[PDB]
Design a protein around this nucleic acid. Structure first.
Ligand SMILES: [Mg+2]
Ligand SMILES: [Mg+2]
Ligand SMILES: [Mg+2]
Lengths: 683, 43
RNA sequence: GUGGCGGCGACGACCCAUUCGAACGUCUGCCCUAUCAACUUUCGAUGGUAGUCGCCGUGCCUACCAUGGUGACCACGGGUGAGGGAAUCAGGGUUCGAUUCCGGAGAGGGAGCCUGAGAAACGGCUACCACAUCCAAGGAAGGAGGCGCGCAAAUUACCCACUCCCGACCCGGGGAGGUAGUGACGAAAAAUAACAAUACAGGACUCUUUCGAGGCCCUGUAAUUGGAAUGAGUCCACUUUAAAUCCUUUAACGAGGAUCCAUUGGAGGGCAAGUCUGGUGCCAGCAGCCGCGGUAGCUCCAAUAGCGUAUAU
């Protein structure tokens, strides 16, 4: 039968990924993308030799096929290759909302069916589970998504948007595909879209790493010095071994007070290092060991690697160490109590974080997920005993800063080499840059401008900021680095709120710009305001319910979502200056969108080789843009002594303090207002 | 698989994507940005 | 005229009778065992009154009463290849005949429950016990035989055309029922040829312990010759049947080396510039597709589509 050649670039990309242990990205376009997954899955099986690949399918609301053996039979009640693929392959189906369940386990291939519902939280969680040479497949089935791709490639400045929400994140997702090394766009047929500009030069690699070479050297050199050697043999990556030696070095010290900090983000082995460190302490003379976590169910891999460290070096399952399980329905299968009696009597006990008592006789206490415990509780667990602290990346930094200032010995070790795949993966680097989940290690110092006198607020344009232009990318990185470095918790979803959520505005405080200056001014403070009321959020609803005030709710006002100042410049008064400039702007004291494409004109647009249309400016002066009239200003924050003094000085008056504290931080939410109705609420 | 190539057994817009002279990266490189509503184009 | 009278059917219906039965009784009659002689009242054994339940009569059951009942005329107890029988019809060259009738019980294991004229259901359900399957881990659904002999296909296929059965029905349905496969344990019948002619030779054949005695209307020749017959096989068409196969008919091809070539067991003959062994110079035993060079289908006997060997007897 007539058969079509498939371009070797698809096979070349897959084979190189398996050999390099690096993942690759595929973007199928068209409503027949499901059949494309079948072909792409089979080619992956030919290259991979370890096992039959596992498939992870993620969808938002509707799945076309039944995925039930009996049900899909009666719906059919001649032969379709897609039906064979579903029944034969081992597919795990998960929802966009229910993505937390698939956090731990690992899959060979990940399929993201629905493009329009993509969120930063979904992307980080699903891509992480892909291992080695696996494929990440993203589909564009809707006709709306296809023409959005069409408008951008025809002209980079022009963009298509129907009618509400702009959805700049999807457009930013499209533009960033060119930068990725391992990205291949294909159609319903096996045809490559030539847009990445690197697809043309793709070639097969000719038929082992510097970090892996060092680990093998350590695994041979540490046979001389042991039982530290046995735990390193259990280790998989080099940076895990270095942390293990650091832990045991702290254990052997003849000092009451010593702290080793394990600073490892997601994807790099963190509980495994803690598990082997506990086994090393058990290998030594340590008897009383305590393990602390917010939940017993949270720590399951830690006790596993304790058992692996135990199993490697004698410690039989019953003759030496005996384990007592949870024996409860809630928080089941957690091993709270571990008892080993080979060397005199030694015991490992899990306790609740709010157990400063029962720690009277402790030699080693291990704190894991330390950021997730309220800050005052961490101090009580310090004590005069050895402490192992592990905190994931992506204040706790203030505590370790105090430890550097001190008495208690400090050791800082960090993990940078991923367990699942090889370092240097193109997909991971592209993913982090798209979500801005990385911060520059060193920030250059700049001169300090006069504080309350010579700084003017500016209006950042949302459309210009998120365009993928190199200058705009650096400015967005500078803003986001300051945006998450505040006391407020950082979440990857906040970038979507900056990009998509309406009625949100960004203002930045700048030094006085000289007439001749560089490409980007330094940013001192960044402030975000969300307009509410007549112009439905925390401030209007909570006041209306609590004070049963009828006239309120017809008033127009905005709340300050976030306020930030640079850490080097903190405490000297840019924060107060920005708020004063807002009040003059909204009171009216200051004297007062990129080209959209019509629905029928999407096809009519031709190629524009050199962009011509003028783009909206990145920063606008406050005088240029007209201002909305706001009756009041508000803020909602976890009540702290430092922030309370700041807001009172600016004129904000409390109206509400939440009864129950937040579980993670142990802080009560507080609402403050500034403008005679305020007099009634305050009384 | 024959060790050389692969043998396997709206649309008008898809045809337009295939016949694209300028890649989106070269489209992106030629692009410029302006700051403060009047400045030298940084791009 | 919100007149009055009417035919032939279908369906349902109280009761009586009838048909098909079903269920309790009466009488008659069972194998071995006495080294089972007494048994029953060991949760009623016999009988009386009243009652419950049941379709009805009744120790069937329950209360209150009497002390009864069976037994050498064998009670009671224990046994008993209780696949095998029992019958039936039909028949000249002895019958390789044919068919029918059952003692119950169960549906993963013991209880409880639902319908109907008829079931304590060949079928639902609930609780307990035992198994096992799917999952997004939350929950959900369930009730037999083959090989172990170098050896696993009927564990199937076609049809309601016959016989009969169920249904609202002349027509639908029936794995009830009918049709179709291999096969030197064995039994029976039968081919692989028959008929003539010519030519050339001179010797058959029986008896006989090497001499011999009888004897001929023929014998032999891997000789030649001739034109009649036929089936093994190949291959049309009817008939058959629900459809087809099979049997019975039948068109055309199908024999001289008729090579279109019968076997198994037993006993003999023939041999070189060949090999080995032992000697009684030239011999004997065993044996001989093998040699100097060369590589392009002898005879006789017994049984006969059948015939040997080993062990035990
Ligand atoms: Mg025979
Ligand atoms: Mg003659
Ligand atoms: Mg002849």
């Amino acid at each position: 039968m007539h058969r079509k050649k498939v371009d070797n670039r698809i096979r070349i990309l897959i084979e190189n990924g398996v050999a390099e242990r690096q993942r690759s990205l595929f973007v199928v376009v068209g409503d027949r993308g499901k059949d494309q997954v079948v072909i792409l899955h089979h080619m992956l099986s030919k290259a991979t030799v370890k096992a039959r690949p596992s498939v992870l399918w993620c969808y938002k609301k509707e799945l076309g096929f039944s995925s039930h053996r009996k049900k899909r039979m009666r719906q059919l009640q001649q032969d379709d290759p897609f039906e064979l693929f579903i029944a034969a392959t081992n597919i795990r189906y998960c929802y966009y909302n229910e993505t937390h369940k698939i956090l731990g386990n690992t899959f060979g291939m990940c399929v993201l069916q629905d493009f329009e519902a993509l969120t930063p939280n979904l992307l980080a969680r699903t891509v992480e589970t892909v291992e080695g040479g696996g494929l990440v497949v993203i589909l564009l089935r809707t006709m709306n998504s296809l023409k959005q791709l069409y408008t951008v490639t025809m002209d980079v400045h022009s963009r298509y948007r129907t009618e509400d929400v702009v959805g700049r994140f999807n457009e930013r997702f499209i533009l960033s595909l060119a930068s990725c090394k391992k990205c291949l766009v294909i159609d319903d047929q096996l045809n490559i879209l030539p847009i990445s500009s690197h697809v043309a030069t793709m070639e097969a690699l000719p038929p082992l790493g510097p970090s892996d070479l060092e680990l093998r050297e350590l695994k041979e050199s540490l046979q001389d010095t042991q039982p530290v050697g046995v735990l390193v043999d259990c280790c998989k990556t080099l940076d895990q071994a270095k942390a293990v030696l650091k832990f045991i070095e702290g254990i052997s010290e003849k000092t009451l007070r010593s702290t080793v900090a394990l600073t490892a983000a997601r994807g790099r082995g963190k509980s495994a290092a803690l598990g082997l460190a506990i086994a090393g302490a058990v290998a030594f003379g340590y008897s009383n060991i305590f393990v602390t976590s917010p939940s017993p169910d949270n720590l399951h891999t830690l006790f596993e690697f304790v058992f692996k460290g135990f199993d490697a070096l004698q410690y039989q399952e019953h003759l030496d160490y005996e384990i007592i399980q949870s024996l409860n329905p809630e928080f089941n299968k957690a091993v709270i109590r571990v008892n080993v009696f080979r060397e005199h009597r030694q015991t490992i006990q899990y306790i609740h974080p709010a157990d400063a008592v029962k720690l009277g006789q402790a030699e080693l206490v291990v704190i894991d997920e330390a950021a997730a415990i309220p800050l005052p509780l961490v101090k009580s667990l310090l004590g005069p005993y050895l402490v192992f602290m592990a905190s994931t990346i992506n204040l706790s930094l203030k505590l370790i800063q105090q430890l550097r200032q001190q008495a208690r010995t400090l050791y800082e070790v960090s993990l940078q080499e991923s367990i699942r795949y090889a370092p240097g993966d193109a997909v991971e680097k592209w993913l982090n840059d798209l979500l801005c989940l990385d911060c520059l290690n060193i920030t250059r110092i700049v001169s300090g401008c006069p504080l309350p006198e010579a700084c003017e607020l500016y209006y950042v344009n949302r459309d210009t900021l998120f365009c993928y232009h190199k200058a705009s990318e650096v400015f967005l990185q500078r803003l986001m680095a300051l945006y998450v470095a505040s006391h407020y918790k950082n979440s990857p979803n906040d970038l979507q709120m900056l990009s998509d959520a309406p009625a949100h505005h960004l203002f930045c405080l700048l030094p006085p710009v000289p007439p001749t200056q560089n490409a980007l001014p330094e940013v001192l403070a960044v402030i975000q305001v969300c307009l509410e009321g007549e112009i439905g959020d925390l401030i209007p609803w909570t006041v209306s319910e609590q004070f049963q005030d009828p006239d309120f709710g017809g008033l127009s006002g905005g709340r300050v979502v976030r306020i930030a100042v640079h850490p080097d410049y903190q405490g000297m008064g840019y924060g107060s200056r920005a708020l004063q400039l807002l009040q003059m702007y909204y009171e009216g004291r200051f004297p007062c969108e990129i080209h959209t494409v019509s629905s029928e004109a999407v096809s009519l647009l031709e190629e524009v080789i050199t962009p011509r249309k003028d783009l909206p400016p990145l920063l606008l002066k406050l005088n240029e843009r007209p201002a909305e009239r706001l009756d009041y200003l508000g803020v909602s924050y976890g009540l702290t002594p430092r922030l309370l003094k700041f807001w009172k000085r600016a004129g904000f008056v409390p109206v509400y303090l939440r009864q129950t504290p937040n579980d993670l931080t142990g802080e009560h939410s507080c609402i403050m207002l500034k403008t005679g109705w305020l007099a009634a609420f305050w009384k | 698989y024959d060790k050389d190539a692969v043998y396997v057994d709206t649309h008008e817009l898809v045809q337009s994507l295939i016949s694209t002279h300028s890649t989106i990266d070269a489209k992106m490189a030629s692009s410029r940005v302006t700051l403060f509503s009047d400045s030298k184009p940084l791009g």
